[PDB]
Short mmCIF file of C-alpha atoms in Angstrom, two decimals:
data_model
loop_
_atom_site.label_atom_id
_atom_site.label_comp_id
_atom_site.label_asym_id
_atom_site.label_seq_id
_atom_site.Cartn_x
_atom_site.Cartn_y
_atom_site.Cartn_z
CA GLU A 1 0.00 0.00 0.00
CA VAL A 2 2.96 2.34 0.84
CA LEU A 3 5.89 2.92 -1.61
CA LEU A 4 9.35 2.07 -0.13
CA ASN A 5 13.03 2.45 -0.91
CA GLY A 6 13.86 1.92 -4.66
CA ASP A 7 10.14 2.16 -5.71
CA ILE A 8 10.13 5.95 -4.83
CA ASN A 9 11.13 7.78 -8.08
CA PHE A 10 10.81 11.61 -7.95
CA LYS A 11 13.25 14.36 -9.06
CA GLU A 12 12.48 16.15 -5.75
CA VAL A 13 11.19 14.91 -2.37
CA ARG A 14 10.98 16.64 1.00
CA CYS A 15 13.02 14.22 3.16
CA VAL A 16 12.41 14.17 6.97
CA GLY A 17 13.77 11.79 9.65
CA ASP A 18 11.83 10.02 12.41
CA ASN A 19 12.66 12.59 15.19
CA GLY A 20 12.17 15.91 13.36
CA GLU A 21 15.48 15.73 11.37
CA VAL A 22 15.36 18.04 8.30
CA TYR A 23 17.23 16.67 5.21
CA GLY A 24 15.63 19.35 2.88
CA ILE A 25 14.41 18.89 -0.71
CA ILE A 26 16.66 16.33 -2.50
CA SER A 27 16.22 13.73 -5.26
CA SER A 28 14.58 10.39 -4.33
CA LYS A 29 17.99 8.81 -5.30
CA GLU A 30 19.79 11.02 -2.74
CA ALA A 31 17.08 10.32 -0.08
CA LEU A 32 17.49 6.55 -0.69
CA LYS A 33 21.34 6.88 -0.42
CA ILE A 34 20.86 8.67 2.96
CA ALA A 35 18.34 6.03 4.21
CA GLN A 36 20.65 3.12 3.16
CA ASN A 37 23.74 4.71 4.78
CA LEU A 38 21.68 5.25 8.00
CA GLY A 39 20.43 1.56 8.05
CA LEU A 40 16.82 2.78 7.52
CA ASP A 41 13.97 2.69 4.99
CA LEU A 42 12.74 5.48 2.76
CA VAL A 43 8.93 5.69 3.24
CA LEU A 44 6.61 7.70 0.97
CA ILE A 45 4.23 9.59 3.34
CA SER A 46 2.52 11.75 0.63
CA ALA A 47 2.78 11.80 -3.17
CA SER A 48 -0.04 14.46 -3.25
CA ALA A 49 2.23 16.98 -1.45
CA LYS A 50 4.53 18.96 -3.78
CA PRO A 51 7.20 18.02 -3.49
CA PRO A 52 6.28 14.54 -2.15
CA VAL A 53 7.03 13.92 1.53
CA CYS A 54 9.31 10.93 2.39
CA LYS A 55 10.57 9.86 5.83
CA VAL A 56 13.84 8.07 6.67
CA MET A 57 12.71 5.64 9.32
CA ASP A 58 12.32 1.94 10.25
CA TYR A 59 9.41 0.72 8.05
CA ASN A 60 8.48 -1.86 10.75
CA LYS A 61 7.78 1.16 13.06
CA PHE A 62 5.67 2.89 10.30
CA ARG A 63 3.65 -0.34 9.75
CA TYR A 64 2.86 -0.65 13.52
CA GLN A 65 2.06 3.13 13.96
CA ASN A 66 -0.69 2.53 11.30
#
């Protein structure tokens, strides 16, 4: 239901961490590189938002929040 990791393809995303960390507006490729280097997932929160909002977080935690 939720797009993750390599399935998130946008030229620009607003990338936020799980405790208020600001990464700014970066490519989905850059956001994925940050998530991978931090041992985390990239989770698409909103594609409707412009630019789309992604979080760098543990997907297992996202899944259980919902």
